């Protein structure tokens, strides 16, 4: 019986710890995937704007030949 008691309280400690741990993981995965996603979006936006810039240089060059 004493061993059973030690096992039960051990189970409780382990289960709370596993909770805190799985929480910490899940949250880190989420924060990191969010940061990767947001950065990707802003990168593609700035790159669209860069292609806009390159086409403006293209236009100016096309006129300085006419």
């Amino acid at each position: 019986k004493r061993e059973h008691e030690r096992e039960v309280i051990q189970k409780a400690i382990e289960e709370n710890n596993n909770f805190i741990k799985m929480a910490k993981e899940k949250l880190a995965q989420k924060m990191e995937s969010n940061k990767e996603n947001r950065e990707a979006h802003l990168a593609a936006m700035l790159e669209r704007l860069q292609e806009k810039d390159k086409h403006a240089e293209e236009v100016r060059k096309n006129k300085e030949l006419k």
């Binding site: 019986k1 004493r2 008691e5 096992e7 039960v8 309280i9 051990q10 189970k11 409780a12 289960e15």
Partner: protein, 424 residues
């Protein structure tokens, strides 16, 4: 053997225990300070059983007060006879147990239990011959229920040859604090089946009913119940505290009340039920005492059969009338007494009556009807368990459904065994 060691665990436990110490301290002439101030010698002849003598006459209840919350025990230190208790013997945590059996038994209680056992050793080692221990608790909360049973085990590990005795309050929907009470009860009934020699089953249901439909108290308080309780506890501890013919011990009681090891669950009864200028007649006391409307359980003895019975008669009356009426109750209703245990109703008389009363009768029954109490609980338990309700509170403390399953089975079995003997 002589000295008893008394333990109060939990709210209900410390409440009924504090009342009990008030009541019998009065009976024994001990003022709230520990000084004897009574007339008779009878009051001090066996005072060693429940009180340790100290310093200038001072008597100190050999009691250990235990709780996981500081409330009820502060309440006790504060109130009437509050400082008759050895201050060292207050052992308390701060967390509480949240009416959770798992918490009192496995997690929070486990922290506190070793300091309790420390005080237990200190008292036991200062005894000439320790009979055993008496515990007060409910089975429906968390501290009393779970921590108390854990203590029962611990103490049995350390004193396997002594007697375990409990006044255990059974829960009832009529008087409920939490829905998990059936679980808690079924868990500790399990422990009690295995680790006590004698448990007085004090059912809150009966105390309610007797408060409501007899004392005619429409709105009963826990004090109303606890006055019935302290009356019973004085009653059934009398022959252990007073000299006389059948100088009683806890073991002889067990030997004389427990035909089979597991069936050690007793039904107490008391007359006259109070809440009294006219003393009754022996006939009255007797018949009141054996009626159900005076049982502190809930079961009707006419539904099963007395295995063993002990009656105590307190006051000044004729022993001839006492013997006549006792044999009249048996000979008349000889159907409700098993025929394979000959001469199973014993009777004692003590001259000192309880406070307020001039004549009184207490009664202790090993009756098969207790199965009803257990059955009630089993049902309530099952209902919830069948849909695994409110189990998270326990599972989150490390427990498994298997434990519950086992417990249930055991109680079911108990009932069965009891029935087996009702048909014999």
């Amino acid at each position: 053997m002589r000295e008893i060691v008394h333990i109060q665990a939990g709210q209900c436990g410390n409440q009924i225990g504090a009342k009990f110490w008030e009541v019998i301290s009065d009976e024994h002439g001990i003022d709230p300070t520990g000084s004897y101030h009574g007339d008779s010698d009878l009051q001090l002849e066996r005072i060693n059983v429940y009180y340790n003598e100290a310093t200038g006459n001072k008597y100190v209840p050999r009691a250990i007060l235990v709780d996981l919350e500081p409330g009820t025990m502060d309440s006790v230190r504060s109130g009437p006879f509050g400082q008759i208790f050895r201050p060292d013997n207050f052992v308390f945590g701060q967390s509480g147990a949240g009416n959770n059996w798992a918490k009192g038994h496995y997690t929070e209680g486990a922290e506190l239990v070793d300091s309790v056992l420390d005080v237990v050793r200190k008292e036991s080692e200062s005894c000439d011959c320790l009979q055993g221990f008496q515990l007060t608790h409910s089975l429906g909360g968390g501290t009393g229920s779970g921590m108390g049973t854990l203590l029962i085990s611990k103490i049995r590990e350390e004193y396997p040859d002594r007697i375990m005795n409990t006044f255990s309050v059974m829960p009832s929907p009529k008087v409920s604090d939490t829905v998990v009470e059936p679980y808690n009860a079924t868990l500790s009934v399990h422990q009690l089946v295995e680790n006590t020699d004698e448990t007085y089953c004090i059912d809150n249901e009966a105390l309610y009913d007797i408060c409501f439909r007899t004392l005619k108290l429409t709105t009963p308080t826990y004090g109303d119940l606890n006055h019935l309780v302290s009356a019973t506890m004085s009653g059934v501890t009398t022959c252990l505290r007073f000299p006389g013919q059948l100088n009683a011990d806890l073991r002889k009681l067990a030997v004389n009340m427990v035909p089979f090891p597991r069936l050690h669950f007793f039904m107490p009864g008391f007359a006259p039920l109070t809440s009294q200028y006219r003393a009754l007649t022996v006939p009255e006391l007797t018949q009141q005492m054996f009626d159900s409307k005076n049982m502190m359980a809930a079961c009707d003895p006419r539904h099963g059969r007395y295995l063993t019975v002990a009656a105590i008669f307190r006051g000044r009356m004729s022993m001839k009338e006492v013997d006549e009426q006792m044999l009249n109750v048996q000979n008349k209703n000889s159907s409700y007494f098993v025929e394979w245990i000959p001469n199973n109703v014993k009777t004692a008389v003590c001259d000192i009556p309880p406070r307020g009363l001039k004549m009184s009768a207490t009664f202790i029954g090993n009756s098969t009807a207790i199965q009803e109490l257990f059955k009630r609980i089993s049902e309530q338990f099952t209902a919830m368990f069948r849909r695994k309700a409110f189990l998270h509170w326990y599972t989150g403390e490390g427990m498994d459904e298997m434990e519950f399953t086992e417990a249930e089975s055991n109680m079911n079995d108990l009932v069965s065994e009891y029935q087996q003997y009702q048909d014999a």
